[PDB]
Design an enzyme around this catalytic site. Structure first.
Site, PDB file in Angstrom:
ATOM      1  N   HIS A  40       0.826  -1.280   0.097  1.00 50.79           N
ATOM      2  CA  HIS A  40      -0.146   0.039   0.019  1.00 50.79           C
ATOM      3  C   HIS A  40       0.857   1.307  -0.045  1.00 50.79           C
ATOM      4  O   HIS A  40       0.076   2.335  -0.069  1.00 50.79           O
ATOM      5  CB  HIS A  40      -0.942   0.125   1.262  1.00 50.79           C
ATOM      6  N   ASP A  84       0.201  -7.653   1.878  1.00 58.43           N
ATOM      7  CA  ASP A  84       0.810  -6.169   1.839  1.00 58.43           C
ATOM      8  C   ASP A  84       2.107  -6.189   1.804  1.00 58.43           C
ATOM      9  O   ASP A  84       2.736  -5.877   3.031  1.00 58.43           O
ATOM     10  CB  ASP A  84       0.041  -5.457   3.047  1.00 58.43           C
ATOM     11  N   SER A 177       4.174   2.697   8.270  1.00 58.10           N
ATOM     12  CA  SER A 177       3.730   1.704   7.114  1.00 58.10           C
ATOM     13  C   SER A 177       5.026   1.306   6.395  1.00 58.10           C
ATOM     14  O   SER A 177       5.733   2.221   5.745  1.00 58.10           O
ATOM     15  CB  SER A 177       2.805   2.308   6.118  1.00 58.10           C
TER      16      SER A 177
END
Ligand SMILES: NC(=[NH2+])c1ccc2[nH]c(-c3cc(CC[NH3+])cc(-c4ccccc4)c3[O-])nc2c1
Ligand SMILES: [Ca+2]
Length: 223
Positions: A40, A84, A177
Site C-alpha cells: 500500500h 501487503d 507503514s
C-alpha cells in the site's frame, strides 16, 4: 511510532525512508540492491533514502537512490490488505558499512511472546499528528493469534500477525507503514495497518514475512 524512544543515529542501519518530496513510508534493506516495504506504499517517483536519522537534515551517511522498479505482490488486495508486501529494486547498489546494512530474512516464523523492534518516522500522537525529525523505536511482543483475531474478528488472514500492547499507549502509526519489525535479528514483519494508533485493544497488524521468503527469493532471482 507512539510511546517509543529515539533510536539513536544509525542504530537501525537497515531502516530506509521512501521519499517523494517528503517521507511517506518506511522499508528495510535486505541486500545492496533491494528493499522490502508494504504494497500500500506503492507510488511512482520513489527515491529510497538510506543511512538517515534526521530526515530533514543532511547529517552525513545518507545515500539517496532512485528506485528502478517496485514489485507489488500480484495477490495484494487493497481492501483487506492481505499480501501487503512490495519489493523495490534500487537503480544502483547501496554501499554497505556499519551505518547502512541489510537485515536477514527469517528461516522460520516467530512465536507469540517474541520481543521485536519496530522503528520509523511516523506519527508519534494517537490523537493528532506530530511527525518526528529523527527515527523512533519501539520494542513490542508478537501477540497470540487468538488475541489478534479477538481484536479484529474476520480481518486477520494467515499472512498477518499482531504485535503490541492491548492496554494502548505504544504502537506504530501512519508514516511507519512499510517499515521493519525485527525479532532476533530477522525481519519478521512489515508495518501494515491497525485501528487508529495506540488505542486500547487494537494492536498493530503486520505482514507475516516468513510466509513470503520463497516468493522474495524467486522474484529477486528473476529481476
Ligand atoms: N495502528 C497501527 N499499528 C498502524 C500501523 C500502520 C498504519 N498505517 C496507517 C496508515 C493510515 C493512513 C490514513 C488513513 N485514514 C494512510 C496510510 C498510508 C500511507 C502511505 C500510502 C498509503 C496509505 C497508512 O499507512 N495507519 C496505520 C496504523
Ligand atoms: Ca538526514
Amino acid at each position: 511510532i507512539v510511546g517509543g524512544y529515539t533510536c539513536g543515529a544509525n542504530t537501525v542501519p537497515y531502516q530506509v525512508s521512501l521519499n517523494s518530496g517528503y517521507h511517506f513510508c518506511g522499508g528495510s534493506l535486505i541486500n545492496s540492491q533491494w528493499v522490502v516495504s508494504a504494497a500500500h506504499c506503492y507510488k511512482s517517483g520513489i527515491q529510497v533514502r538510506l543511512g538517515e536519522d534526521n530526515i530533514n537534515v543532511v547529517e552525513g551517511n545518507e545515500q539517496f537512490i532512485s528506485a528502478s522498479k517496485s514489485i507489488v505482490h500480484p495477490s495484494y488486495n487493497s481492501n483487506t490488505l492481505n499480501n501487503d508486501i512490495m519489493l523495490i529494486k534500487l537503480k544502483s547498489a547501496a554501499s554497505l558499512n556499519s551505518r547502512v546494512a541489510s537485515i536477514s530474512l527469517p528461516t522460520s516464523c516467530a512465536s507469540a511472546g517474541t520481543q521485536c523492534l519496530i522503528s520509523g518516522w511516523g506519527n508519534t500522537k494517537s490523537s493528532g499528528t506530530s511527525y518526528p525529525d529523527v527515527l523512533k523505536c519501539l520494542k513490542a511482543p508478537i501477540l497470540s493469534d487468538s488475541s489478534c483475531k479477538s481484536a479484529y474478528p474476520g480481518q486477520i488472514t494467515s499472512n498477518m500477525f499482531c504485535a503490541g500492547y492491548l492496554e494502548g499507549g505504544k504502537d506504530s502509526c501512519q508514516g511507519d507503514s512499510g517499515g521493519p519489525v525485527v525479532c532476533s535479528g530477522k525481519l519478521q514483519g512489515i508495518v501494515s495497518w491497525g485501528s487508529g494508533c495506540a488505542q486500547k485493544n487494537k494492536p498493530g497488524v503486520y505482514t507475516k514475512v516468513c510466509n513470503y521468503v520463497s516468493w522474495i527469493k524467486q522474484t529477486i532471482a528473476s529481476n
